[PDB]
Amino acid sequence: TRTEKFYLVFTEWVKLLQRVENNDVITTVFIKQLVEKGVISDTDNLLTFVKSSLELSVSSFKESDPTDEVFIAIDALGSLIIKLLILQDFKTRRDYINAIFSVIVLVFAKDHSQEGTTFNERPYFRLFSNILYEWATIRTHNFVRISDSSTRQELIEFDSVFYNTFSGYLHALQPFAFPGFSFAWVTLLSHRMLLPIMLRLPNKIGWEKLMLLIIDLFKFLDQYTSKHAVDAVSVVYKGTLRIILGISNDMPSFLIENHYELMNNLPPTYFQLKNVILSAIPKNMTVPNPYDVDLNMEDIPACKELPEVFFDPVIDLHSLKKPVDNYLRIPSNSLLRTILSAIYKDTYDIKKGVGYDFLSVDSKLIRAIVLHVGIEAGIEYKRTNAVFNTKSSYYTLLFNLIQNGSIEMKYQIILSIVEQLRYPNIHTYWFSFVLMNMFKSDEWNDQKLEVQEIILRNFLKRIIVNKPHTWGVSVFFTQLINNNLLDLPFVQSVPEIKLILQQL
Amino acid sequence: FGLKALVPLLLGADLSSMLYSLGIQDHRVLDTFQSPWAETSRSEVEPRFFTPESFTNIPGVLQSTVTPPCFNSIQNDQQRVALFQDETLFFLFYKHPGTVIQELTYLELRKRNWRYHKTLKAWLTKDPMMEPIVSADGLSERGSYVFFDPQRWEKCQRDFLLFYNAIM
Amino acid sequence: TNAAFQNPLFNDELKYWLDSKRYLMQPLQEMSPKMVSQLESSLLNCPDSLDADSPCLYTKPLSLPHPTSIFFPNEPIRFVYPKKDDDIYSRTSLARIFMKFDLDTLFFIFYHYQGSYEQFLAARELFKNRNWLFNKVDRCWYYKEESWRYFDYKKSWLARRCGNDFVYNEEDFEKL
Ligand SMILES: [Ca+2]
User: Fold this and answer.
1) Any chain A CB within 8 A of the CB of C171?
2) Number of domains in chain A
3) Burial class (CB in 10 A: 0-12, 13-18, 19+), A425
4) Where does the protein end up (chain A) (predicted)?
């Protein structure tokens, strides 16, 4: 008669929410009178009640006709959960929310993976969306709708916990783990009562879990997208692109300050999405016409500012950190030699493909080193002169990394460098200087034309694609057509790219 | 070095239409974000919003003895409905089908010399600046009218051949 | 590792949960036929805006049922667009059309859909775009042109002047 107790309780709840408004004090009296009886006080009773209500609600969805309200029980359940969080005294609230999410994802998993499955993603999606809405509705204006000032303060403190918990479970519900939920999952990632809030929690405490989720997405895309592997996945890409566009519009600093991890996990053939992420521009900045031939970054204050980096790439340099910093601080040729050897030893990896192993360049590490050199360069410039110089440790380190590297090594270095050409800031400026000097350098050991072709390639990848183009790339390319191109031998060797060039 | 490279064969997509699909001056689009896909973005969604307590339980609206107000009486609610402007009646008529207030706004609009077109589901009224000319069979008249367009919230003048079996 | 997963009441479920971790144990995989099916049906059941929309199981009725003409609309209308800074509501069909609404219709909506989003947007139009102020104490909307006026929602449904002895006390007005 305990099963019947929980079933009847939930049924009565559903009937009530179809008769009175959600905020009706009759509801509050219901929950408090529910909690006086103690029928869900003890842990097993609570887990059993949430489980049974969940199963009944999902079944209710399944056995309803589309013309009905198929989410009634689900909707009521969302309300009941958040009201159970609000209207109780908590000695432990994190333990509660964690328990409830646990029950949900457990029932979810069994519904999804079992043999004769009749799984639908929608009722669970609806459950999560509703939870999001309910919390969104009670949280407005620092939980002002909560009467007790103590309880109010408690919820205020709990807010961030709520969102990072939700995100944690959402993370565990990612496409790799539960493909049958994928689209719903993606929708939840960009839910209007999840993404804009976690983009905006104070001191960026929402950014990490967001990046976790976005990385999950990118990885899922990369696994099932190649140049040859041409479908559902493409649909998922399209949605992703929409989401990233929204983010670029609303919170560009999120795309700007996470470009390292975002590039580390982004599929290499997603040219457009790469440009979209790197074209992000801080909210109230207006950029100069990038095609202005008479442009000069010396005459732009913005080009002297240091961009923010949410995750310091130096971590990913591991032991290399200490030597690389040494050489940058006070350069010498023997130290240069040593760290070149160290870097090479770490960047030339053996990757395990299917049926055979092969040599592989550690492109993530390369990006980390290039970004690190850029950051330290910008910092040295702010400290103050000798940073925009060929003799400088930063330029020399990148130069010699390219010079003594394999063709793949060269291409990767130059790629990460071009990635750093974004909005007007000190990185875009300095790396443009670096690139141009490399293009014009007379210090290449019989690899001048190779470097030039690699550079030119890395730019055509960024401009012969549809808009957006990043500011620095449009600028650099403009300076490239109007300096000291078609006379280059390797450009003549190919008529197809020669033509696209000729349009320019 | 063939691969590293200068031999590409021929991503890319015009993002203009996709950007117009979202809400793009500076404007947040994410707080009204319907879905990651267009084909499945088939309705606007309710954003977060703040309702002060003073917005609720407002007593005595138009002398109502109950809170919130309601319109449940054909006989007694005409006096309240009469106080509303044409547009407000249109709003009610298009928002509450099969209710007392739809019937009361129909009757009130009818009284203000609006006529309801059955197949267009749109209200029209005579443009005073011209006199109708009834057709020879008497089943229609040709005249100048003002139609109300509830999607543009506009009165719209039109020369029109109007059939009497089509209005009520 | 977590407390609810280790309860016998969920033992069976736990198995499937643990299965979800399999993709971590094997390094990389071409898409299983099964996974293709799952992904295909996830595409099929993809949640739409209506699924993502806010829940509402009950609203106090505005008006009793009545036998109306079959020629009237039989479903509620859905509006779609065919400091006055920008906010998240600025480009919604509702907000954009409320810009075209008469004070009469805005005041109606404000007092007859209390607690609703329509009310919220009406109040927003009134406050943000027409410089009316709302009073916590008498629930009236005021407007200033030393001469004040208020909309008499209680009786006359018109704008009435306040007396000469009216003073604006900010503590009595709602901060919007
Ligand atoms: Ca390595």
Assistant:
1) no
2) 2
3) buried
4) Nucleus
Closest CA in chain B for residue C44? B40
Q: Reading across the β-sheet that carries C133-134, which strands appear in turn? A: C133-134, C141-144, C148-152, C158-161
Residues 6+ apart with CB under 8 A from B143: B126, B127, B130, B131, B132, B133, B159, B160, B162
Give me A452's structure tokens: 């030039």
Centre of ligand 1 from the C-alpha of residue A310, in Å: 23
Residue B147 sits in a domain whose CATH number is 2.30.30.1020
Residues A80 and A120 in one domain: yes
- Phi first, then psi, for residue C143 (nearest 5°) are -145, 145
- CB atoms B121 and C64 under 8 Å: no
Point out which residues pair with B147 in neighbouring strands. Answer: B124, B156
Last residue of some domain: A224, A244, A278?
A278
Rounded CA-CA distance A190/A193 in Å is: 8
Alpha helix stretches (DSSP H) within A353-442: 363-383, 393-403, 407-419, 426-440
Q: Does B5 touch chain A (CB under 8 A)?
A: yes
Residue C152 pairs with which residues in a beta bridge? C158
Residues in chain C after which the chain is broken, C→N over 2.5 Å: 82, 145
Domain that holds residue A206: 2-278
For residue A263, give both structure tokens: 């590039």
Interface residue of B106, B151, B165 to substitute, partner C, most C CBs within 10 Å? B151
Taking the CB of residue A364, how many other CB atoms lie within 10 A of it? 18
One domain, residues A136 and A250: yes
Same domain for A162 and A187, yes or no, is yes
The Cα–Cα gap between C17 and A173 comes to: 10
Task: Give the whole-angstrom CA distance, residue A93 versus residue A96.
Answer: 5
**What CATH number does residue A186 fall under?**
1.25.40.790
β-partners of residue C141 are C134
Do the chains contact at C3 and A103, CB–CB below 8 Å? no
Q: What is the total count of domains within chain B?
A: 1
How far does the centroid of ligand 1 lie from the alpha carbon of residue A316, in Å?
10
Among candidates C109, C141, C147, which has minimal Cα distance to C128?
C141
Q: Of A363, A253, A374, A268, give the one whose Cα is nearest residue A316.
A: A363
CB contacts, 8 Å: C59 with chain A: 21
Dig out the tokens for A356 from the structure.
Answer: 């055979």
Method of determination used here: X-ray
The tokens of C138 are what? 């008498």
CA–CA separation, C40 and C31 (whole Å): 12
Query: Which residue does chain A place closest to C26, by CA atoms?
Result: A176
Residues whose CB is less than 8 angstroms from the CB of residue A221 and which lie 6 or more positions away in sequence, other chains included? A233, A236, A237, A240, A267, A270
Q: How far apart are the CA of C93 and the centre of ligand 1, in A?
A: 53
Q: Residues with Cβ < 8 Å from A416, sequence gap 6 or more?
A: A263, A363, A366, A367, A370, A371
* Amino acid of residue C19: D
User: Among A278, A304, A330, which residue terminates a domain?
Assistant: A278
Q: Which amino acid is at A475?
A: V
Taking contacts as CB-CB distances below 8 angstroms, the residues of chain C near A232 are 36, 39-40, 42-43
Contact assignment for B22 to A249 by CB distance below 8 Å: yes
CATH of domain C1-176: 2.30.30.1020
Which residues in A lie closer than 8 A to residue B45 (C-beta atoms)? 192
Residue extents of the structural domains in chain C:
1-176
Residue A25 CB: number of other CB atoms within 10 A? 9
Cα distance between the two ends of chain B: 80
Residues A328 and A367 grouped into a single domain: yes
CATH number at residue A461: 1.25.40.800
C65 C-beta neighbours (distance < 10 Å), count: 10
Residue of A9, A79, A83 lying closest to C56 (CA atoms):
A79
**Quick one: A139 and A227 in the same domain?**
yes
Domain with B32 in it:
1-168
Which DSSP symbol is given to C65? B
